[PDB]
Amino acid sequence: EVHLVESGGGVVQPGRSLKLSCAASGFTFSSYGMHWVRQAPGKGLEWVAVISHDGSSKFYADSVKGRFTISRDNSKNTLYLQMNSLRAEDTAVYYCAKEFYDSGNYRPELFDYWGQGTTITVSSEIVLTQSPSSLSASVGDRVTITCRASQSISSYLNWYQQKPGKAPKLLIYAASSLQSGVPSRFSGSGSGTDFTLTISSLQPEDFATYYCQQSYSTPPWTFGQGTKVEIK
């Protein structure tokens, strides 16, 4: 029942301004931190900004610091991103994402639910590496995806599924815990610098790009470059 609806995107020239909005429903909006994450066309996921449940704490990716402002109105259940001084490499789909734990939980945070995104086109840290980059397999096969971290991240490694054209979906959190509603064929293992996602018997609906991301050392939250899984 969680719903997140982004709006405000469009085509703009460099140096212009644009306000994005994210309307939330189906959960207690004021209990959760919220994030913006973006994805340039043909590229991977890049964390943009975070705001705590009451708006008192805010962090930004270095590439947007001083130009973007994250904001929230808990009376309207709406998250904002004020983007000023826009530029070509800000072109991307922008997603809002709800945090996973409540406000009194110390644990490294992650992206429970994502909206479908709003598109922006601008006119004319711990590094994670995934292997393989792409693979083709058949229904019923085992698929194994590796994620290596440049630096120990303990257990705070999460996996997302992104179907073509859809918002990402949390599959695994804290290296091996299954997100609710995720089928049992998905499992995760590992610790430190070495993690594996396995799909034990690939199904037709599993063709997607799979991303790891680390929550140990933040900001910034960082992502692997993605592993594309195709069904032959």
Binding site: G33, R107, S154, T218
Partner: peptide
């Protein structure tokens, strides 16, 4: 300003 093993935004709500 970078945290390790803790959510960096929730410090005012943690014990």
């Amino acid at each position: 300003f970078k945290c390790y093993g803790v959510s960096p935004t929730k410090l005012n709500d943690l014990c």
